[PDB]
Design an enzyme around this catalytic site. Structure first.
Site, PDB file in Angstrom:
ATOM      1  N   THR A 139     114.214   5.400   1.669  1.00 43.32           N
ATOM      2  CA  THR A 139     115.776   5.581   1.981  1.00 43.32           C
ATOM      3  C   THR A 139     116.343   6.569   1.243  1.00 43.32           C
ATOM      4  O   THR A 139     116.198   6.872   0.212  1.00 43.32           O
ATOM      5  CB  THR A 139     116.312   4.245   1.632  1.00 43.32           C
ATOM      6  OG1 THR A 139     115.840   3.240   2.658  1.00 43.32           O
ATOM      7  CG2 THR A 139     117.856   4.337   2.232  1.00 43.32           C
TER       8      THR A 139
HETATM    9  C1  LIG Z   1     113.550   4.203   2.463  1.00 45.66           C
HETATM   10  C2  LIG Z   1     113.534   4.606   3.927  1.00 45.66           C
HETATM   11  C3  LIG Z   1     111.994   3.957   1.881  1.00 45.66           C
HETATM   12  O1  LIG Z   1     112.264   3.447   0.697  1.00 45.66           O
HETATM   13  C4  LIG Z   1     114.374   3.051   2.336  1.00 45.66           C
HETATM   14  O2  LIG Z   1     114.419   2.359   1.093  1.00 45.66           O
HETATM   15  C5  LIG Z   1     114.024   1.900   3.343  1.00 45.66           C
HETATM   16  C6  LIG Z   1     115.296   0.980   3.427  1.00 45.66           C
HETATM   17  C7  LIG Z   1     115.810   0.679   5.036  1.00 45.66           C
HETATM   18  C8  LIG Z   1     114.607   0.543   6.004  1.00 45.66           C
HETATM   19  C9  LIG Z   1     116.589  -0.580   4.930  1.00 45.66           C
HETATM   20  N1  LIG Z   1     113.116   1.030   2.813  1.00 45.66           N
HETATM   21  C10 LIG Z   1     112.049   0.552   3.436  1.00 45.66           C
HETATM   22  O3  LIG Z   1     111.507   1.188   4.572  1.00 45.66           O
HETATM   23  C11 LIG Z   1     111.042  -0.473   2.720  1.00 45.66           C
HETATM   24  C12 LIG Z   1     110.464   0.050   1.791  1.00 45.66           C
HETATM   25  C13 LIG Z   1     109.708  -1.151   1.174  1.00 45.66           C
HETATM   26  C14 LIG Z   1     108.585  -1.560   1.808  1.00 45.66           C
HETATM   27  C15 LIG Z   1     108.023  -2.862   1.355  1.00 45.66           C
HETATM   28  C16 LIG Z   1     108.820  -3.638   0.240  1.00 45.66           C
HETATM   29  C17 LIG Z   1     110.001  -3.241  -0.229  1.00 45.66           C
HETATM   30  C18 LIG Z   1     110.499  -2.038   0.274  1.00 45.66           C
HETATM   31  N2  LIG Z   1     110.454  -0.820   3.945  1.00 45.66           N
HETATM   32  C19 LIG Z   1     110.162  -1.958   4.469  1.00 45.66           C
HETATM   33  O4  LIG Z   1     110.827  -3.091   4.245  1.00 45.66           O
HETATM   34  C20 LIG Z   1     109.191  -2.169   5.577  1.00 45.66           C
HETATM   35  C21 LIG Z   1     109.851  -1.985   7.027  1.00 45.66           C
HETATM   36  C22 LIG Z   1     108.918  -2.129   8.129  1.00 45.66           C
HETATM   37  C23 LIG Z   1     107.523  -1.981   8.209  1.00 45.66           C
HETATM   38  C24 LIG Z   1     109.569  -1.497   9.472  1.00 45.66           C
HETATM   39  N3  LIG Z   1     108.317  -3.562   5.772  1.00 45.66           N
HETATM   40  C25 LIG Z   1     107.567  -3.881   5.005  1.00 45.66           C
HETATM   41  O5  LIG Z   1     106.675  -3.062   4.173  1.00 45.66           O
HETATM   42  C26 LIG Z   1     107.167  -5.057   5.479  1.00 45.66           C
HETATM   43  C27 LIG Z   1     107.743  -6.434   4.449  1.00 45.66           C
HETATM   44  C28 LIG Z   1     107.505  -6.032   3.126  1.00 45.66           C
HETATM   45  C29 LIG Z   1     107.621  -7.495   2.334  1.00 45.66           C
HETATM   46  C30 LIG Z   1     108.636  -7.763   1.464  1.00 45.66           C
HETATM   47  C31 LIG Z   1     108.386  -8.873   0.880  1.00 45.66           C
HETATM   48  C32 LIG Z   1     107.651  -9.677   1.082  1.00 45.66           C
HETATM   49  C33 LIG Z   1     106.714  -9.332   1.975  1.00 45.66           C
HETATM   50  C34 LIG Z   1     106.428  -8.012   2.820  1.00 45.66           C
HETATM   51  N4  LIG Z   1     105.351  -5.254   4.954  1.00 45.66           N
HETATM   52  C35 LIG Z   1     104.619  -5.161   6.122  1.00 45.66           C
HETATM   53  O6  LIG Z   1     104.917  -4.779   7.180  1.00 45.66           O
HETATM   54  C36 LIG Z   1     103.164  -5.118   5.809  1.00 45.66           C
HETATM   55  N5  LIG Z   1     102.190  -3.952   6.396  1.00 45.66           N
HETATM   56  C37 LIG Z   1     102.578  -3.416   7.782  1.00 45.66           C
HETATM   57  C38 LIG Z   1     101.648  -2.499   8.008  1.00 45.66           C
HETATM   58  O7  LIG Z   1     100.413  -2.897   7.862  1.00 45.66           O
HETATM   59  C39 LIG Z   1     100.068  -3.160   6.839  1.00 45.66           C
HETATM   60  C40 LIG Z   1     100.840  -4.506   6.262  1.00 45.66           C
END
Ligand SMILES: *[C@@](C)(CO)[C@](*)(O)[C@H](CC(C)C)NC(=O)[C@H](Cc1ccccc1)NC(=O)[C@H](CC(C)C)NC(=O)[C@H](CCc1ccccc1)NC(=O)CN1CCOCC1
Ligand SMILES: [Mg+2]
Lengths: 231, 195, 243, 250, 235, 240, 244, 212
Positions: free
Chosen positions: H1
């Site tokens: 982000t």
């Molecule tokens: C910028 C773009 C990157 O840092 C921003 O900070 C964004 C914020 C926006 C989207 C609000 N953050 C993210 O994109 C964020 C980074 C992140 C990832 C994981 C943990 C903390 C922060 N990404 C996510 O939240 C993603 C978004 C999905 C994929 C669209 N989600 C995941 O990674 C999920 C859930 C994570 C999680 C958190 C807590 C407990 C359990 C899981 N994880 C997955 O979907 C697992 N993964 C998917 C791909 O196949 C392998 C498994």
């Protein structure tokens, strides 16, 4: 007299007056009829309004795709008991992948009502219920009383002037039991049955309430213009 | 958080506190006030773990303000410091302890004396002529040992404090974006705007 | 006075009037009996046909506990069900811990203590049922009868309900005439006769007969209901005796 | 189910009386006489052993009870209430004192704890007061010998000498004539036996009387030797024979 | 004494029946439903002239699409409103949508019988709940302490209820405009009220699909009072 | 826990425990609230059957809930302390979460809610107390005066009185208070308050307490001599 | 159920009075009189023991006067057992305050909390109230010497001189007569005794039927001393004022 | 982000990217990172998607309940403190959020509060939050003046996100703009970086590092 202060007290002749007073609330309630053949099971209910400006109090409640009931007495108590049935039917589905038997549905209601009649503080339920349903042993009709007593029947009625419809069904027993594979005729028989409990008022389009369940029919309720066919 | 200092002189207590709030490789803010007024003649500066600091400070502030309303009376600096210590002493054996270090500067109106108390997150209390928390002490204490006298004025104390900030600005690794200075005396609490 | 208004209160006699009032509710109920035989027990009950609209055979009143105990009761039917539900829980935990199915005397005390507990406090009502029950265990056959007070004894024959005195008299004749013992298949027939004879005390509404039995040889030690040919044979035997 | 009696069964009446406490004191009045006398070098507590049946063994029923090695207790009123109070009193002496300070509580403080238990039965939900008055005698290093009376209300008073129960009014008068501040322990035992004879009606001997003293330390009753500071219990229960010896020179 | 959840010999709960008597002592509230909207009006009834009438809050917002009027022991309604608002907002959080007026009323009525020996007694207040949703359109509900609710085309509750209800029976039809309904509430309130009706001792409100739930100003109501008096004199 | 439903409906639709709590309020010493154009004044009666009192230490009748809101009462003194304590805690809790002191309406609503809760909770009796809550909202100069009562209902008042003989002083205020023109100054507001209490009190010596609240946390209590001057002035104008 | 036997201790009368509180006050009016008098340089606490027996141990006895801490004492009137429950609570409360703030508890704060406990027993819980009235005598550096009273209702008030228990009506009139503000401790001692001597239900006031205690600044420089009078000291002070 | 929001003469600009990532996998290019709480309040999202999305919509429900109860729109300070006190209760449990609560009220004026998942709550004029915050700061700080016009302020917010979107691998997709005035928030469109980068390069003459 001195033995009706609460449900925990027996009278000298062995009566529970609070349970009997709860039974009295059913007699004041609007009439509702239940009957069944071998294929289907029908509920007919006369709804009651406050005045011409008000809606008509809904009497019939769905419990599952294959089970539901009609009520007579305290409506909030019916809502509590129906909600309990909804959960028990749902527990049976989720845990055993099994439709809850109508007979077990009765046993569960009996035991829930009973606990309220043997403890201090609580009160009996003030509503009677007619439970219809189609399960693995065909169609079923049950009568619930808040004393705890549940009874399986071919037909019955509860509420004010329920004796008229109950007598009619006792005469018509041999006829309506063999109405198999014909929903409209089994309803016609139930509508004619409830008509024997009417005084000064007749069955109108927003007055009547019919519900059916059977072999190839989920538990559904008919109101409004959908019951105009049966007047 | 990081730098909080305190100097008790003849007639007042002076608290200096850094303005920087850093998180990761970014200085998010350069004008942060790391203090709360507990009562009209009592001031508490704080430093430590993010979130905990302000949450703890405001919680103490609320309790002291509650006391004041209830009794229509101001608690002594000594009484306030003891209350704060006990709260931290409870905290350290909790499931999640407050990681906050505080300095409490106050003027006792009954004794007509300024008082400075240093309390760490464990609940370790000491009354001092001059105090500091964190790495700040490693430079300031030896400097104050030399230049401090017990009979100094408020103006002399501020010059002594300028000497400390200059030394920190010369030898500390991190940029803490200067300090907010506040004075506690018989007339209450006031902020020096040009430091 | 006022000694009868609250449960668990002793009267100056040393009596709990609330329990005696619960007995009145039992006396009002339909007739039920138990007959102990050679290698088991037999239970029977009177079901009043209130209306043509009652589905025959489909309002079952006798209840099984575990796989080897049968229970029948007279009085407040819901109170009887509550007691059986507890009986089932008691039997389950006994089998859980000790592996073996609960012995009948052990089971008898579990109910007895539970019913007795409901005479100790004013915040609960005594049970409005007398329960006849029993079955077959490692030591053989046992028949029991439990009352609102918590009192129970072992029995050769037992009866309760509106026609208890008629049934008791008829039971006493069987005990006298059969000192060596009665067979399971005989006891089923006798049970039918006694219910039909006890029906004379409730003869406005006609009735439906319901019988069950546990026997070491006939049912293999398990509780079963009597149905079909064996039921109709027992009904016919009873019909022949009243005329 | 569950205790629905969460409310007080003892309440103030319009006249300001606490009915149940008054009625508990009435039960104590009906009870058998017991007394206590304080000497310079000891304390004596005594009572009549009212036997319920001559087939009963009155030795198995102890009216005078040891609470600590230096504290004893006797009562008038309802025996069952007394028995459970002794159990609770013995336990509280350990839990709220000995397990904290490594020594036994002084007489006044143990008495205070018993009083607390009896006060709570006067105010707590769903209970009646205890139907007993206690007399507690004891010794401790810093207070010396002492005698206390504890009533159903939870009140306690120290006494030079006193009596409670059936014939307490006469027995208190008798003790006023005989009690002085120079009484030796033996003199106090003598006066105790004289006072008790007035209220007793039937047999008067070591088998119908129960008497215990708080006097000198008894190393022979300690059960072990080796520790100089541990010198034995000051509480001793007089034997049936020891009473009869003093009844001859009466 | 006797149990709180005791049945009378006629089969009614004593406490519920006694709470209904408390509601009859309350100030009047009227509601009328039309195809153009639902109108809610109440009698304020200040106990003394020194009391600032605008602080009397007997009409209340639950959500943008649901309003509520009350009558009886009005202090008891605070926790009912608090529950209703939470129920409405919570449903919007769980389902990203407005909550049906009927489902809101059912949720409030579930509190009603949660008393015994839960709270110590039933509520001593009746509610008129008015609202709109996409499925069943404009709706008016009467929620009692018995746990029952009826839908109404029009309804009056309080001290002048039986007289006002008889008047609503004659005046209501299925083609009533919103303006016609506003006047009708004012007309019927003026009839049953003790003191003379004005903008300070009576309050109007409505709910429409377009603008949502609105409590009228004292200026707006005053004009509708003047318009009403003129129309009655005009024949 | 003690569960008994003490507050319950009667056949005629009354909750007698709530109504008997109002009788306790009627027994209590009189209290009056009058709000002017730029102030609110709280007056209170103190009974004179108690001489040898120590007025330094005796609990005052008017209590500060925050630096900008005050609460006076009529009824059971011990009951009032519980309400005051709760109100004071909520006041600090509001500052902590909303970062703004309470409004007078909000503080009243809370106190009224507490009172209501005790009318349908098991095991408890209602508060035998009615309160007058007065002050100024943060950054606002419009005076606020609210009343609460045991039932839980609350409302705003231009001027109000509670306690014993309150119906006499309410009668006085109803003809002496003009809505179109409230007391324009502090002196006018205090005088009308003292006048109203002099209809009921007895002597204007150590029987009347007066507390004046002005905007921006400006609250002060008048001394004996200061109040006595109002008493002396009113009596001289009366002889006419 | 148990509803039948509930006295309902925490309800109002039709007149708006708390039955049990009123009856507890009636109980207290039969307890031995206790007097508190506050002087400029100290406080006197005098109390009459309830009809004494000659075989009562007088020196090792405590019935009326209890120490709460080094700066606060109380005189009791009512049920002693009830008073001791409340005293131990008050003693603990004082130590909690000292532990928290490192300062001796202000007298009023202690009095308020003890009174708040009594109040609770009149509003909730369904228990009987405590049948006790206290006279609090204490010192702190904010208000100096202070006298308070609390009663079963949980209502407390401050006083210059006050009596509780028996004959308070007669006692209060006598105190109101002879009390003045510039009074010294030794004068207050004499007033306290003279008042009990006239209001007593006994034939003559003697040393064995009294408990006495002063709270002076009569220690050495700016510190407060509590004196609980011994029997012989009461005998002497009774002779010194010419009562015996 | 990458998310930013700054205060200026004409109110508050709020700009965010629209990328979501799971490691190096670009999961979405069209994520809404601004949460509309009411006509006057905005919330930005950075960190864990579910954490931010879930608790900021929850925040909206708490703000709605405030205005129902208090008959008045909630202050920005009070709204931000509801969120910050909530996450503080979960401190240590593992929530991951960097949020900014922006809005205008009468008593406060335009106000921005930084709130993160370790409980930090800060009032301020300029904040950049996210993995690409430093890149946004670089452009934003060097070009920021209080006296910026509404037109120029919108562009600078847009241009700062573009700067970060370009350099930070975990930022990109499109830019979402928001202007917050005394009257409320106004939406100023979705701007795809695909077209926007080249358009800005050509017209502005910047991004000379890139092969034209
Ligand atoms: C910028 C773009 C990157 O840092 C921003 O900070 C964004 C914020 C926006 C989207 C609000 N953050 C993210 O994109 C964020 C980074 C992140 C990832 C994981 C943990 C903390 C922060 N990404 C996510 O939240 C993603 C978004 C999905 C994929 C669209 N989600 C995941 O990674 C999920 C859930 C994570 C999680 C958190 C807590 C407990 C359990 C899981 N994880 C997955 O979907 C697992 N993964 C998917 C791909 O196949 C392998 C498994
Ligand atoms: Mg990139």
């Amino acid at each position: 007299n001195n033995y009706d202060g609460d449900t925990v007290t027996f009278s000298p002749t062995g009566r529970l007056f609070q349970v009997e007073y709860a039974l009295e609330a059913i007699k004041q309630g609007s009439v509702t009829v239940g009957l069944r053949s071998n294929t289907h099971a029908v509920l007919v209910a006369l709804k009651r309004n406050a005045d011409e400006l008000s809606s008509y109090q809904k009497k019939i409640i769905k419990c599952d795709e294959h089970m539901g009931l009609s009520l007579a007495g305290l409506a909030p108590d019916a809502r509590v008991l129906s909600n309990y049935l909804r959960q028990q039917c749902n527990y049976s589905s989720l845990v055993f992948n099994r439709k809850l038997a109508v007979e077990r549905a009765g046993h569960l209601l009996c035991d829930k009502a009973q606990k309220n009649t043997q403890s201090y503080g609580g009160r009996p339920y003030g509503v009677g219920l007619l439970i219809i349903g189609y399960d693995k042993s065909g169609a079923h009709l049950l009568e619930f009383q808040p004393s705890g007593n549940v009874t399986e029947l071919y037909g019955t009625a509860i509420g004010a002037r329920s004796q008229g419809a109950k007598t009619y069904l006792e005469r018509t027993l041999d006829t309506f039991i063999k109405i198999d594979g014909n929903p409209d005729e089994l309803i016609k028989a139930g509508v004619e049955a409830i008509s024997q409990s009417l005084r000064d008022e007749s069955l109108t389009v927003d007055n009547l309430s019919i519900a059916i369940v059977g072999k190839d029919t989920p538990f559904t309720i008919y109101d409004g213009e959908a019951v105009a066919k049966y007047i | 958080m990081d730098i909080i200092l305190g100097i008790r002189v003849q007639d007042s207590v002076i608290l200096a506190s850094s303005k920087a709030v850093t998180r990761g490789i970014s200085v998010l803010k350069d004008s942060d006030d790391k203090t709360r007024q507990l009562s009209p003649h009592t001031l508490m500066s704080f430093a430590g773990e993010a979130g905990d600091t302000v949450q703890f400070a405001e919680y103490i502030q609320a309790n002291i303000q509650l006391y004041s309303i209830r009794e229509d009376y101001e608690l002594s600096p000594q009484a306030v410091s003891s209350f704060v210590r006990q709260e931290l002493a409870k905290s350290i054996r909790s499931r999640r302890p407050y990681q906050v270090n505080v300095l409490i500067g106050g003027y006792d109106k009954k004794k007509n004396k300024p008082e400075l108390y240093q309390i760490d997150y464990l609940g370790t209390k000491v009354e001092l002529p001059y105090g500091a928390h964190g790495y700040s002490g490693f430079y300031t204490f030896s400097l104050l040992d030399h230049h401090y006298r017990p009979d100094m004025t408020t103006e002399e104390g501020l010059d002594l404090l300028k000497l400390c900030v200059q030394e920190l600005e010369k030898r500390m690794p991190m940029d803490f974006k200067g300090v907010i200075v506040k004075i506690v005396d018989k007339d209450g609490i006031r902020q020096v705007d040009d430091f | 006075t006022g000694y009868d208004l609250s449960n668990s209160v002793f009267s100056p006699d040393g009596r709990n009037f609330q329990v005696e009032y619960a007995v009145k509710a039992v006396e009002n109920g339909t007739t039920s009996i138990g007959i102990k035989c050679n290698d088991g027990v037999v239970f029977a009950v009177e079901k009043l046909i209130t209306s043509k609209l009652l589905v025959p055979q489909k309002n079952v009143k006798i209840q099984v506990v575990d796989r080897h105990i049968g229970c029948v009761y007279s009085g407040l039917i819901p109170d009887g069900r509550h007691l059986v539900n507890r009986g089932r829980e008691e039997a389950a935990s006994f089998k859980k811990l000790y592996k073996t199915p609960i012995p009948i005397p052990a089971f008898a005390d579990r109910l007895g203590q539970y019913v007795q507990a409901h005479t100790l406090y004013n915040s609960v009502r005594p049970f409005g049922v007398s329960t006849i029950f029993g079955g077959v265990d490692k030591n053989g056959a046992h028949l029991y009868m439990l009352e609102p007070s918590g009192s129970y004894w072992g029995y050769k024959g037992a009866a309760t309900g509106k026609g208890r005195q008629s049934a008791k008299a008829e039971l006493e004749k069987l005990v006298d005439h059969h000192p060596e013992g009665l067979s399971a298949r005989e006891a089923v027939k006798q049970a039918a006769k006694i219910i039909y004879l006890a029906h004379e005390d409730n003869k406005e509404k006609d009735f439906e007969l319901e019988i069950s039995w546990c026997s070491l040889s006939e049912t293999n030690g398990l509780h079963k209901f009597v149905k079909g040919d064996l039921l109709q044979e027992a009904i016919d035997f009873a019909q022949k005796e009243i005329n | 189910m569950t205790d629905r009696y969460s409310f007080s069964l003892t309440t103030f009446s319009p006249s300001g009386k606490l009915g149940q406490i008054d009625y508990a004191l009435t039960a104590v009045k009906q009870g058998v006489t017991s007394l206590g006398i304080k000497a310079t070098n000891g304390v004596v507590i005594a009572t009549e052993k009212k036997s319920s049946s001559p087939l009963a063994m009155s030795e198995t029923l102890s009216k005078v009870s040891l609470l600590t090695p230096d504290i004893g207790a006797v009562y008038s009123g309802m025996g069952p209430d007394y028995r459970v109070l002794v159990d609770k009193s013995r336990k509280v002496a350990h839990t709220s004192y000995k397990r904290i300070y490594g020594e036994y509580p002084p007489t006044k403080l143990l008495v205070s704890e018993v009083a607390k238990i009896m006060q709570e039965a006067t105010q707590s939900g769903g209970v009646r007061p205890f139907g007993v008055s206690l007399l507690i005698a004891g010794h401790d290093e810093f207070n010396g010998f002492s005698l206390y009376q504890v009533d159903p209300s939870g009140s306690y008073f120290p006494w030079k000498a006193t009596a409670i129960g059936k014939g307490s009014v006469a027995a208190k008068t008798f003790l006023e004539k005989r009690w002085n501040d120079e009484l030796e322990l033996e003199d106090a035992i003598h006066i105790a036996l004289l006072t008790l004879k007035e209220s007793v009606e039937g047999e008067f001997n070591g088998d119908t009387i129960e008497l215990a003293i708080i006097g000198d330390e008894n190393p022979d009753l300690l059960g072990y030797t080796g520790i100089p500071t541990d010198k034995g219990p000051r509480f001793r229960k007089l034997t049936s024979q020891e009473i009869n010896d003093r009844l001859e020179a009466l | 004494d006797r149990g709180v959840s005791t049945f009378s010999p006629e089969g009614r709960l004593f406490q519920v029946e006694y709470s209904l008597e408390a509601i009859k002592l309350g100030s009047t509230a009227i509601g009328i439903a039309t195809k153009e909207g639902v109108v809610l009006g109440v009698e304020k009834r200040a106990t003394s002239p020194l009391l600032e009438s605008d602080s009397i809050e007997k009409i209340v917002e639950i959500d943008r699409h649901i309003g509520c009027a009350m009558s009886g022991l009005t202090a008891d309604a605070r926790s009912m409103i608090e529950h209703a608002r939470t129920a409405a907002v919570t449903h919007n959080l769980y389902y990203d949508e407005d909550i049906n007026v009927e489902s809101l009323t059912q949720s409030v009525c579930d509190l009603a019988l949660r008393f015994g020996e839960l709270m110590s007694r039933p509520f001593g207040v009746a509610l008129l709940i008015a609202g709109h949703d996409a499925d069943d359109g404009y709706q008016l509900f009467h929620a009692e302490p018995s746990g029952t609710f009826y839908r109404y085309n029009a309804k009056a509750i309080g001290s002048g209820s039986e007289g006002a209800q008889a008047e609503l029976l004659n005046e209501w039809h299925s083609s009533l405009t919103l303006k016609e309904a506003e006047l009708l509430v004012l007309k019927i309130l003026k009839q049953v009220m003790e003191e003379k009706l004005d903008e300070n001792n009576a309050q109007l409100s409505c709910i429409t699909k377009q603008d949502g739930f609105k409590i009228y100003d004292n200026e707006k109501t005053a004009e509708l009072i003047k318009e009403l008096k003129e129309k009655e004199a005009a024949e | 826990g003690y569960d008994r439903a003490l507050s319950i409906f009667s056949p005629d639709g009354h909750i007698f425990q709530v109504e008997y709590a109002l009788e306790a309020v009627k027994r209590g010493t009189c209290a009056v609230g009058v709000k002017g154009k730029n102030c609110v004044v709280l007056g209170c009666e103190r009974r004179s059957t108690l001489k040898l009192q120590d007025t330094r230490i005796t609990p005052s009748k008017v209590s500060k809930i925050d630096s900008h809101v005050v609460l006076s009462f009529s009824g059971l003194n011990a009951d009032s302390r519980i309400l005051i304590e709760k109100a004071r805690v909520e006041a600090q809790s509001h500052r902590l979460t909303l970062e703004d002191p309470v409004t007078v309406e909000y503080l009243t609503r809370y106190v009224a809610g507490v009172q209501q809760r005790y009318t349908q909770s098991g095991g408890v009796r209602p508060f035998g107390v009615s309160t007058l809550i007065a002050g100024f909202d943060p950054r606002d100069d419009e005076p606020k005066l609210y009343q609460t009562e045991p039932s839980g209902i609350y409302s705003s008042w231009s001027a109000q009185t509670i306690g014993r003989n309150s119906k006499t002083v309410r009668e006085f205020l109803e003809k002496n208070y003009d809505r179109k023109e409230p007391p324009a100054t502090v002196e006018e507001c205090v005088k009308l308050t003292v006048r109203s209490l002099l209809e009921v009190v007895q002597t204007g010596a150590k029987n009347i307490e007066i507390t004046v609240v002005k905007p921006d946390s400006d609250i002060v209590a008048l001394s004996s001599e200061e109040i006595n001057q109002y008493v002396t002035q009113i009596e001289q104008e009366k002889q006419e | 159920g148990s509803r039948r036997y509930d006295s309902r201790t925490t309800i109002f009368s039709p007149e708006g009075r708390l039955y049990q509180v009123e009856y507890a006050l009636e109980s207290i009016s039969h307890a031995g009189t206790a007097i508190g008098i506050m002087a400029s340089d100290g406080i006197v606490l005098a109390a009459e023991r309830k009809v004494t027996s000659t075989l009562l141990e007088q020196d090792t006895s405590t019935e009326k006067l209890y120490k709460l801490n080094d700066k606060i004492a109380v005189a009791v009137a009512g049920l002693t057992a009830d008073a001791e429950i409340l005293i131990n609570t008050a003693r603990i409360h004082a130590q909690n305050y000292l532990k928290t703030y490192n300062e001796d508890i202000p007298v009023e704060i202690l009095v308020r909390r003890l009174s708040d406990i009594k109040q609770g027993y009149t509003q909730h819980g369904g228990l009987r109230p405590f049948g006790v009235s206290f006279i609090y005598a204490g010192y702190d550096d904010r208000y100096g010497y202070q006298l308070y009273t609390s009663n079963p209702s949980g209502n407390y008030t401050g006083w210059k001189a006050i009596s509780v228990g028996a004959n308070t009506s007669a006692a209060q009139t006598l105190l109101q007569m002879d009390y003045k503000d510039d009074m010294k401790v030794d004068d207050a001692i004499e007033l306290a005794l003279k008042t009990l001597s006239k209001t007593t239900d006994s034939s003559a006031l003697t040393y064995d039927r009294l408990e006495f205690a002063t709270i002076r600044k009569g220690a050495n420089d700016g510190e407060v001393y509590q004196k609980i009078f011994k029997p012989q000291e009461i005998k002497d002070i009774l002779v010194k004022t010419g009562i015996t | 982000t990458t998310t930013l929001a700054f205060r200026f003469q004409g109110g508050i600009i709020v700009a965010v990217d629209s990328r979501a990532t799971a490691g190096n996998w670009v999961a979405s290019q069209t994520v809404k990172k601004v949460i509309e709480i009411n006509p006057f309040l905005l919330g930005t999202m950075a960190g864990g998607t579910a954490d931010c999305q879930f608790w900021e919509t929850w925040l909206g429900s708490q703000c709605r309940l405030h205005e129902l109860r208090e008959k008045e729109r909630i202050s920005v300070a009070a709204a931000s403190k509801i969120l910050s006190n909530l996450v503080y209760q979960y401190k240590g449990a593992g929530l991951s959020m960097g949020t900014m609560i922006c809005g205008y009220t009468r008593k406060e004026g335009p106000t921005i509060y930084y709130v993160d998942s370790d409980g930090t709550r800060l009032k301020g004029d300029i904040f950049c939050v996210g993995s690409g915050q430093t890149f946004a700061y670089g452009v934003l700080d060097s070009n920021y003046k209080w006296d910026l016009s509404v037109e120029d302020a919108l562009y600078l917010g847009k241009r700062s996100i573009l700067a970060a979107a370009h350099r930070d691998a975990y930022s990109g997709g499109s830019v979402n703009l928001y202007h917050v005035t005394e009257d409320g928030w106004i939406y100023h469109g979705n701007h795809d970086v695909g077209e926007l980068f080249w358009k800005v390069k050509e017209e502005e003459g910047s991004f000379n590092n890139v092969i034209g």
